[PDB]
Design an enzyme around this catalytic site. Structure first.
Site, PDB file in Angstrom:
ATOM      1  CE  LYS A  44      -3.574  -1.800 -17.105  1.00  0.00           C
ATOM      2  NZ  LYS A  44      -4.674  -1.487 -18.160  1.00  0.00           N
ATOM      3  CB  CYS A 131     -13.322  -2.810 -12.512  1.00  0.00           C
ATOM      4  SG  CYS A 131     -12.210  -4.204 -12.221  1.00  0.00           S
TER       5      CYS A 131
HETATM    6  C1  LIG Z   1      -4.688   1.221 -23.620  1.00  0.00           C
HETATM    7  C2  LIG Z   1      -5.614   1.728 -22.504  1.00  0.00           C
HETATM    8  C3  LIG Z   1      -5.511   1.191 -21.237  1.00  0.00           C
HETATM    9  C4  LIG Z   1      -6.370   1.604 -20.218  1.00  0.00           C
HETATM   10  N1  LIG Z   1      -6.270   1.022 -18.959  1.00  0.00           N
HETATM   11  C5  LIG Z   1      -6.960   1.547 -17.947  1.00  0.00           C
HETATM   12  C6  LIG Z   1      -6.715   1.116 -16.612  1.00  0.00           C
HETATM   13  O1  LIG Z   1      -5.795   0.260 -16.395  1.00  0.00           O
HETATM   14  N2  LIG Z   1      -7.443   1.710 -15.619  1.00  0.00           N
HETATM   15  C7  LIG Z   1      -8.358   2.666 -15.854  1.00  0.00           C
HETATM   16  O2  LIG Z   1      -8.906   3.223 -14.878  1.00  0.00           O
HETATM   17  N3  LIG Z   1      -8.652   3.104 -17.116  1.00  0.00           N
HETATM   18  C8  LIG Z   1      -7.942   2.596 -18.128  1.00  0.00           C
HETATM   19  N4  LIG Z   1      -8.163   3.047 -19.404  1.00  0.00           N
HETATM   20  C9  LIG Z   1      -9.083   4.153 -19.582  1.00  0.00           C
HETATM   21  C10 LIG Z   1      -8.434   5.511 -19.619  1.00  0.00           C
HETATM   22  O3  LIG Z   1      -7.904   5.744 -18.291  1.00  0.00           O
HETATM   23  C11 LIG Z   1      -9.434   6.609 -19.940  1.00  0.00           C
HETATM   24  O4  LIG Z   1     -10.454   6.596 -18.899  1.00  0.00           O
HETATM   25  C12 LIG Z   1     -10.163   6.403 -21.271  1.00  0.00           C
HETATM   26  O5  LIG Z   1      -9.202   5.991 -22.284  1.00  0.00           O
HETATM   27  C13 LIG Z   1     -10.806   7.712 -21.753  1.00  0.00           C
HETATM   28  O6  LIG Z   1      -9.881   8.821 -21.866  1.00  0.00           O
HETATM   29  P1  LIG Z   1      -9.352   9.272 -23.332  1.00  0.00           P
HETATM   30  O7  LIG Z   1     -10.566   9.651 -24.108  1.00  0.00           O
HETATM   31  O8  LIG Z   1      -8.365  10.369 -23.033  1.00  0.00           O
HETATM   32  O9  LIG Z   1      -8.695   8.019 -23.931  1.00  0.00           O
HETATM   33  C14 LIG Z   1      -7.308   2.660 -20.459  1.00  0.00           C
HETATM   34  C15 LIG Z   1      -7.398   3.227 -21.729  1.00  0.00           C
HETATM   35  C16 LIG Z   1      -6.577   2.807 -22.746  1.00  0.00           C
HETATM   36  C17 LIG Z   1      -6.707   3.430 -24.055  1.00  0.00           C
HETATM   37  C1  LIG Z   2      -9.930  -7.817 -16.201  1.00  0.00           C
HETATM   38  O1  LIG Z   2     -10.356  -7.501 -17.523  1.00  0.00           O
HETATM   39  C2  LIG Z   2     -10.829  -6.147 -17.709  1.00  0.00           C
HETATM   40  C3  LIG Z   2     -11.778  -5.849 -18.710  1.00  0.00           C
HETATM   41  C4  LIG Z   2     -12.266  -4.539 -18.906  1.00  0.00           C
HETATM   42  C5  LIG Z   2     -11.788  -3.496 -18.041  1.00  0.00           C
HETATM   43  C6  LIG Z   2     -10.801  -3.717 -17.090  1.00  0.00           C
HETATM   44  C7  LIG Z   2     -10.248  -2.760 -16.242  1.00  0.00           C
HETATM   45  C8  LIG Z   2      -9.010  -2.124 -16.884  1.00  0.00           C
HETATM   46  C9  LIG Z   2      -9.297  -1.270 -17.946  1.00  0.00           C
HETATM   47  C10 LIG Z   2      -8.886  -1.578 -19.204  1.00  0.00           C
HETATM   48  C11 LIG Z   2      -8.138  -2.825 -19.591  1.00  0.00           C
HETATM   49  O2  LIG Z   2      -7.081  -3.131 -19.034  1.00  0.00           O
HETATM   50  O3  LIG Z   2      -8.636  -3.428 -20.563  1.00  0.00           O
HETATM   51  N1  LIG Z   2      -9.190  -0.729 -20.301  1.00  0.00           N
HETATM   52  C12 LIG Z   2      -9.957   0.427 -20.114  1.00  0.00           C
HETATM   53  O4  LIG Z   2     -10.284   1.155 -21.080  1.00  0.00           O
HETATM   54  N2  LIG Z   2     -10.362   0.703 -18.839  1.00  0.00           N
HETATM   55  C13 LIG Z   2     -10.067  -0.089 -17.718  1.00  0.00           C
HETATM   56  O5  LIG Z   2     -10.430   0.266 -16.594  1.00  0.00           O
HETATM   57  C14 LIG Z   2     -10.348  -5.063 -16.918  1.00  0.00           C
END
Ligand SMILES: Cc1cc2nc3c(=O)[nH]c(=O)nc-3n(C[C@H](O)[C@H](O)[C@H](O)COP(=O)(O)O)c2cc1C
Ligand SMILES: COc1cccc(CCc2c(C(=O)O)[nH]c(=O)[nH]c2=O)c1
Ligand SMILES: Cc1cc2nc3c(=O)[nH]c(=O)nc-3n(C[C@H](O)[C@H](O)[C@H](O)COP(=O)(O)O)c2cc1C
Ligand SMILES: COc1cccc(CCc2c(C(=O)O)[nH]c(=O)[nH]c2=O)c1
Lengths: 313, 313
Positions: A44, A131
């Site tokens: 994460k 981000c």
């Molecule tokens: C619940 C959730 C949490 C996510 N948190 C992050 C994150 O902490 N860091 C990040 O780089 N992307 C985060 N993403 C984005 C995913 O890494 C991914 O780029 C995005 O969901 C697209 O891939 P998918 O179509 O397989 O869902 C998150 C996505 C979801 C659904």
């Molecule tokens: C700090 O609040 C945030 C708002 C939008 C994106 C992010 C970065 C983490 C992240 C998140 C998330 O933690 O919401 N979800 C994604 O789909 N991609 C991400 O990269 C943080």
């Protein structure tokens, strides 16, 4: 026939891994991912301090994909650093650690402390550029000057090969500019395309309501919605960054979707929404499905087709 | 119960119309749309001179949507102006003419000629801010200073209420900046959200090829892929532009999907991919389906629920 890869001085049984944020927040999550058939895992995205994230409901999934505004809930850097330094079994598979500090100095402080663990244990850094920075400015990777600052500072502080997680772009001028910025940094060895498609809005017709609480229902989209967007970004950066790897992320539900990513140029293939919905058993399915497509086509390795998408005439 | 409404000093039988570019290029197409049950029609975005557009194949559709790189094929402004001035039957429904000059000066030149036809006949102008890529320059709507220039120059040259077709935005700061630009121009009376999601890439697994010829397969995405994107833009601009109408476009295949657009803020609802796929009979279905959902809910008017999407706490 085999799905093996060797990249970044690591060996991967197969190209599949979780997408950052999915099944990777807690120790339990990381042990699960490690027990799975995936080729790797990523933790994460973390901040220096623990965060509870946004109020719930903050993630919802539907037949065509997901929406989330999680707010970066995470156990804090020290936990993920401890996981990398002392808990992860590197004999099972490689580990990536994702960082997403809220400022350039927060990222700098983290990568300074990650460096010696990266050098000794081989954890790989994924820097999340998709981000927030200053509220009222665009996310960092949508602000090319901020992006350059972040990469300059992290490159100097960390001093080791790392990769970057990019949001999707939608304009050829942005592909060009973004890749030119990345190509300024020789330590950026991989580029993960894509993060969620930002600020979508899902509305439920029966209740007449948005489906997530934060941000008046606006959140990042994943899943089937985003596969052509993901593929375009993978291919755009594959073409523009010939000295870097590209990892694909977005819309993978099947070995066929993975095969498309790889044709577009993907090395590793990350799985977000589909993994959140199906669970870690998805990895055996995706491996079997991709091997079946390879067998039908007579492909024995991934390199035989990676980046080999045909154009027309 | 009927779906008729009044906007922009015109009466509409229902809120549906084609999306610019679909079923609206030739006189045949415009007569077909006029004969349909749609409440209005819009012409293909035009240039001062005729264009053949890009090489075929340049549009393809799939279960979840479409991809196109048409290249602005069109019969030229003189043709569309003649249609508006001499051919269109305004007793049937309102007409919008879409213009997409390749420079500010071209748009100025066309709008100066449209103005008296707008006064005399009531044709409405939809100004398309999207255009073929020019290396080194972003799309106009993604370059807020360029957007401000276009709107300043068109507003001065035209002098009458008009609308603007926008590409999607994916970042809240961008929504804030874009809406503030638009709100500088009182003559911008409607905003159409959205154009196709730019530069996606559809790959066929069997052939290992992209599916459109131009742009190495890259093209704008429409259809089911883009509904949450579309709703988010509609709502974002509905919230930010209280003195303007918002027209929704993107991912409409059913009266439910239209219902969601209207909940989000849409006054008119435009139909692209689904119309291209199903043909003009789609309008009678969408009308029946929207009235059915209204009836189940107890709504007698569109005004009762337009913009009334609920948020959570
Ligand atoms: C619940 C959730 C949490 C996510 N948190 C992050 C994150 O902490 N860091 C990040 O780089 N992307 C985060 N993403 C984005 C995913 O890494 C991914 O780029 C995005 O969901 C697209 O891939 P998918 O179509 O397989 O869902 C998150 C996505 C979801 C659904
Ligand atoms: C700090 O609040 C945030 C708002 C939008 C994106 C992010 C970065 C983490 C992240 C998140 C998330 O933690 O919401 N979800 C994604 O789909 N991609 C991400 O990269 C943080
Ligand atoms: C074949 C085709 C041609 C189009 N040409 C135009 C155009 O000339 N002007 C324009 O404003 N949008 C044009 N678009 C975009 C559509 O008007 C619409 O914004 C987009 O397809 C999203 O709606 P949808 O999901 O209903 O397809 C075109 C779309 C398609 C599929
Ligand atoms: C490849 O040609 C174009 C690229 C971007 C924009 C335009 C303007 C016309 C247009 C087209 C088109 O004619 O390709 N397709 C769209 O989806 N939206 C549009 O606005 C053409």
């Amino acid at each position: 026939m085999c799905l093996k890869l060797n990249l970044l001085d690591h060996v991967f049984a197969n190209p599949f891994m979780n997408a950052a944020g999915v099944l990777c927040s807690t120790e339990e999550d990381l042990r699960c991912m490690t027990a799975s058939s995936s080729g790797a895992l990523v933790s994460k995205s973390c901040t220096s301090a623990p965060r509870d994230g946004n109020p719930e409901p903050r993630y919802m999934a539907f037949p065509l994909g997901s929406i989330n505004s999680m707010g970066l809930p995470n156990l804090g850097f020290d936990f993920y650093l401890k996981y990398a330094s002392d808990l992860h079994d590197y004999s099972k598979k490689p580990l990536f650690l994702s960082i997403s500090g809220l400022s350039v100095e927060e990222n700098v402080a983290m990568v300074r402390r990650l460096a010696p663990v990266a050098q000794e244990k081989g954890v790989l850094l994924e820097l999340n550029l998709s981000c927030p920075n200053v509220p009222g400015k665009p996310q960092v990777a949508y602000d090319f000057e901020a992006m350059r600052t972040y990469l300059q500072q992290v490159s100097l502080a960390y001093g080791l090969p790392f990769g970057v997680k990019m949001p999707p772009y939608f304009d050829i001028a942005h592909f060009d500019t973004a890749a030119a910025v990345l190509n300024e940094f020789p330590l950026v060895k991989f580029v993960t395309c894509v993060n969620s498609v930002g600020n979508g809005l899902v509305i439920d017709a029966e209740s007449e309501s948005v489906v997530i609480k934060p941000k008046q229902g606006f959140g990042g989209l994943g899943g089937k919605y985003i596969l052509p967007t993901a593929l375009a970004n993978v291919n755009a950066f594959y073409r523009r960054c010939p000295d870097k790897l590209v990892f694909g992320c977005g819309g993978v539900y099947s070995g066929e979707d993975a095969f498309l990513h790889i044709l577009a140029g993907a090395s590793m293939v990350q799985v977000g929404t589909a993994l959140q919905e199906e669970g870690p058993g998805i990895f055996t399915r995706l491996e079997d499905e991709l091997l079946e497509i390879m067998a039908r086509k007579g492909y024995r390795t991934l390199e035989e087709f990676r980046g080999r998408v045909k154009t027309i005439e």
